[PDB]
Ligand binder design. Structure first.
Ligand SMILES: [Zn+2]
Length: 258
């Protein structure tokens, strides 16, 4: 009876095993555009993915992760609201059973069809294991997905989901360029928060892009074909794997644009 997204082990039950679920800096949250202040001191974001080296794709039972080689400063994130250099280790998505819901963060209460998360860790702590334990150990880049024209850079990902339908399967996945998943503009919102799935550690500096990328209806429909279950068990489709907004508790969201 591990944690999940069902009616008897979902978001409202997580606090029993993980008390921090009701903490002071939890994620996600809603972005009230009326109260998110433009901050003239915020710097431009720096994203360097040209030397990104991918290795594998996997189904972990609650989403699918594309793992990267993080032994050197290949893909790094710096600048913006940060005071250090962070390395890319993996990315994954969150989506719904229908186009009308699926994102974790919201803008003026409105929900998108899905949300992309690029996870990086602060190099001053040595490795991921030690970084997740510090309040400034991670930096996560979130991008909204809305229905429209197909996204060319996402096709390589969607074409391999056939090989990892059930929980536990994996496959080689080399030479994928994450630059094809970025929008045109880099304006952003930023605030201190946490991981959105257990253990829910409060170790993240969030950077959410204002401009969403466009994907086709046919592309999102394929995310919905994966399974939460393992081979040979009651089929349960991997849909609606998103956590609702949490209380803000006097935290302030800053904007890098007027
Ligand atoms: Zn996530």
């Amino acid at each position: 009876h591990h944690w999940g997204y069902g009616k008897h082990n979902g978001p409202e039950h997580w606090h029993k095993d993980f008390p921090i679920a009701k903490g002071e800096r939890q994620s996600p949250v809603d972005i009230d555009t009326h109260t998110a202040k433009y901050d003239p001191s915020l710097k431009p974001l720096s994203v360097s993915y040209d030397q990104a080296t991918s290795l594998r794709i996997l189904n972990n039972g609650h989403a699918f992760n594309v793992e990267f080689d993080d032994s050197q400063d290949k893909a790094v994130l710096k600048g913006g609201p940060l005071d250090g250099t962070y390395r890319l280790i993996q990315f994954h998505f969150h989506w719904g059973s229908l186009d009308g819901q699926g994102s974790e963060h919201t803008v003026d209460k409105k929900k998108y069809a899905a949300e992309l998360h690029l996870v990086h860790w602060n190099t001053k702590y040595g490795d991921f294991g030690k970084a997740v334990q510090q309040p400034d150990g991670l930096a996560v880049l979130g991008i909204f997905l809305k229905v429209g024209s197909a996204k060319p850079g996402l096709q390589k990902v969607v074409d391999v989901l056939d090989s990892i339908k059930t929980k536990g399967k994996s496959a080689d996945f080399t030479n994928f360029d994450p630059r094809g998943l970025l929008p045109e503009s880099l304006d952003y919102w930023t605030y201190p928060g946490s991981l959105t799935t257990p253990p829910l550690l409060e170790c993240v500096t969030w950077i959410v892009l204002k401009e969403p990328i466009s994907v086709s209806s046919e592309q999102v429909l394929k995310f919905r074909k994966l399974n939460f279950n393992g081979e040979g068990e009651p089929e349960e489709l991997m849909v609606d794997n998103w956590r609702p907004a949490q209380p803000l508790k006097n935290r302030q969201i800053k904007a890098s644009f007027k």
